[PDB]
Amino acid sequence: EEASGKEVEKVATAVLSTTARAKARAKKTKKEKGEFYKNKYSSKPYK
Amino acid sequence: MVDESDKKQQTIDEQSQISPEKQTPNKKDKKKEEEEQLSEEDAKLKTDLELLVERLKEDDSSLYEASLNALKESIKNSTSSMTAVPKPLKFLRPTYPDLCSIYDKWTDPNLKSSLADVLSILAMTYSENGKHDSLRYRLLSDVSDFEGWGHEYIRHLALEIGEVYNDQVEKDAEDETSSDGSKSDGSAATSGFEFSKEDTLRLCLDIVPYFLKHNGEEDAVDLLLEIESIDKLPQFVDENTFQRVCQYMVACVPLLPPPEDVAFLKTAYSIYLSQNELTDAIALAVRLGEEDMIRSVFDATSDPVMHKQLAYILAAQKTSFEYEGVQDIIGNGKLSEHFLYLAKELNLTGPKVPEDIYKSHLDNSKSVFSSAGLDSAQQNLASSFVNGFLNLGYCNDKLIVDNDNWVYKTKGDGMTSAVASIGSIYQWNLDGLQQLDKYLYVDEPEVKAGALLGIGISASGVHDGEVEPALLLLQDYVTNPDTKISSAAILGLGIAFAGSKNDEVLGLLLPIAASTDLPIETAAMASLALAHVFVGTCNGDITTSIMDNFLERTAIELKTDWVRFLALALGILYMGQGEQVDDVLETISAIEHPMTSAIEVLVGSCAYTGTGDVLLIQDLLHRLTPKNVKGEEDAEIKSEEKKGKSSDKDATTDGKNDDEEEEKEAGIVDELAYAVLGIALIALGEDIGKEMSLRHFGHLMHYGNEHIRRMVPLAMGIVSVSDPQMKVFDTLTRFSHDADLEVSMNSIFAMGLCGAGTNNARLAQLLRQLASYYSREQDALFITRLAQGLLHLGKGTMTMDVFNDAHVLNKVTLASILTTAVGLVSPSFMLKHHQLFYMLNAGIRPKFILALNDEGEPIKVNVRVGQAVETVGQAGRPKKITGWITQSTPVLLNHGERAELETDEY
């Protein structure tokens, strides 16, 4: 993917989170108050 | 410490520090074998109780753990607490400390957790016996001294607390929760609590408030009444009982929602009513603001005693003290019904006697003028208003006014306001009407209007007892159909009567405040008066105002000015209440428009007040949102928008001020810092937002009653000299006014520098000048405060016009409003039956020391000062009465209340 692939992902994850926690946090608080590979063999066949 | 066997009774205690033989082995064997030893065990209980008492003094963790180790096992392992029934139940006296030794003396995380739960269950079972109470008492009042119990005893009490609090947080309640394992109510633990309360109230203070707020009921509070009212004088003086009661209520203020918080303080008032001092009573009745409670304390002195006595004089004094005058109206006419003397009584309740006393003060304080000499153009206008701003309250400066030369050179809107400033020379005075009359009967309609405003100001101090009411003069003007005339008339009536919602005043104002289809700017004054009238007492949230706010919106949107003023009148109207105001937020919100959304955020502040910390976070999410949405994308509308933005900012500030006052005095410091971070956030983000928040800030301070006055107004001022809207300076000066000549020494130089230095527009100059004069009253004539004064938690009514005007860009029209500034404080004096006009002596102390009260009752040491001195502002507010050494007794406890002192000499 190289770096530019990774930039898209990390930013998408984080924005959704900054938006949500901005106000979800404030709200909730106050509520109460108011084997190192080797062969990797596998017993099951595949095709 | 070492074993040393049974040689003597001293070494028997030593023997049992390592291994008991009269508590362990023997008893254990007996219980696990024969059941005729049940009989030996009963006699041996006493012996066992004594051995604890002796080794209590030993504190080391190891020689209590291990010693009683096997007894702890025995509860479930060998006895199983029902091998002989009754017999372990009454034998749980000593086994209950064994458990506590693992909770607390030794800390093993696994057992300390688990055994909390056990301890709770058994506290309950053993409190049926009512012997669990006695176990508690022998550690609470002590027998022996060791560190250990000072930590331990808290746990026993904590069991009760645990459960009771949780029943609010989790609905399932009772012993279904395995967190305690103990039933929330029932006739087994309830009797335990009452008895526990008794012993802890005598010796301690810790748990008595916790129990009330966790039950949540006004009922817990009403049990407290019974016990404490026995204690009122023989166990300890009046004074002490009072300091506890209000410590309970003031400390838990932030965490009581609206319905709960009124419901608790009812009970504190009544406690006060029962006890000797009725002086403590009147003060709480006022807090609540209910009509019903004012009348009982006034009645209690007037009706029983047939004779005049002390009793009539005292009733009048007490109602006289609120200068909202809400109490004044209610109490009047009882005096008439009884008929001993009409003449003394009626005048004394009335704020008519408060004018007379003012003359005595004025006499020390003398006259120093400092008014502007500047004439011609807008500078003429500036100076003529400035004359009134310096001679606020009763002053005599007749001669200057009579020089009609400068009067007549005012023009336009300046003419109305010029006459209006004249009225404030005779503010709080009977006499002065004369000056106003000359103009009212001659020249353009403008001078006529300005006369009515001034009447409004003069009448502030004489409008009860049916002695020249403002209602009398101003009715004639309402009928006259010209708009300027009629608008002016109802603005002054509203000001004068203040809180007084008398039948004639109210009802004149009732058909009206209901035409907004015709497009008229100045009809802001239609609702604006009625809102003012309403504050100071519980609201109806009148159906006249609510209907008309909506109608105006239907009709117009053109006059942006008209609708911004309207929005505020609604929020000011709901002041005096909060419970009923949760309803009207919805009602308003039913109809939805972006224009209506501006009205809502305002009203939210009054409904949530007094528990607000949800409100706070809300008024900050608002702020952010214009910018924020824009933020996402980057990686007719005109009127609606502007109302939107501006409203929010007002609302944030109002919210803060009201919360900090009532809540913790500590919190006053923190809220100012939060504001500074709000403004900083705005200066960068929105250009338009910055303008509004500057003006709001000055009234943030004046409302909130900041402790600091030296640093913060000054510092802020400097940045804002560069910044447009010189109306900033006026809002700061209303805070800074303080005890004149303390804060305000710095102030005149600081406000004066920017004005005098810079002149680049006379428009700009005018705001600056007025601000300056306001600040100082010559040789401490009076002080203004937003607060009542009588309570320091309290909020005024007359000062609400000041609070209204900092929401709009400056206008010459606005200048006319600005003249009105009312909110006087009387200087206390010791009264006599011939009405002595002199104080003997007083203590003043900048800072209270008492930490039992957050208010801090006066110390009794103080620093001593002379007769006839103003009741000082901040850094002088704590005031104690010195008179006791001349064998004089206050009847009216004064702690630095507005109230006038009163004395009885032996």
mmCIF file of C-alpha atoms in Angstrom, chain A residues 15 18-19 22-23 26-27 30-34, chain B residues 165 169 254-255 257 611 613-614 617 621 628 632:
data_model
loop_
_atom_site.group_PDB
_atom_site.id
_atom_site.type_symbol
_atom_site.label_atom_id
_atom_site.label_comp_id
_atom_site.label_asym_id
_atom_site.label_seq_id
_atom_site.Cartn_x
_atom_site.Cartn_y
_atom_site.Cartn_z
ATOM 1 C CA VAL A 15 -11.647 11.608 12.957
ATOM 2 C CA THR A 18 -12.342 12.885 17.923
ATOM 3 C CA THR A 19 -15.951 13.812 16.885
ATOM 4 C CA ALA A 22 -15.737 15.397 22.072
ATOM 5 C CA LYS A 23 -19.065 15.390 23.738
ATOM 6 C CA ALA A 26 -18.658 15.154 29.001
ATOM 7 C CA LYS A 27 -22.160 13.727 28.896
ATOM 8 C CA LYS A 30 -22.166 14.173 34.594
ATOM 9 C CA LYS A 31 -25.148 11.781 34.191
ATOM 10 C CA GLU A 32 -24.856 10.297 37.576
ATOM 11 C CA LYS A 33 -24.630 13.781 39.084
ATOM 12 C CA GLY A 34 -27.925 15.337 37.508
ATOM 13 C CA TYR B 165 -26.682 5.915 48.383
ATOM 14 C CA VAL B 169 -28.056 4.980 41.576
ATOM 15 C CA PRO B 254 -24.600 21.784 43.728
ATOM 16 C CA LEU B 255 -25.947 18.274 43.833
ATOM 17 C CA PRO B 257 -31.794 19.284 41.431
ATOM 18 C CA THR B 611 -27.711 22.323 39.912
ATOM 19 C CA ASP B 613 -23.006 21.625 35.397
ATOM 20 C CA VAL B 614 -24.887 20.086 32.482
ATOM 21 C CA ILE B 617 -21.049 21.943 28.968
ATOM 22 C CA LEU B 621 -20.902 22.937 22.559
ATOM 23 C CA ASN B 628 -16.835 22.869 13.636
ATOM 24 C CA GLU B 632 -15.480 18.642 8.584
#
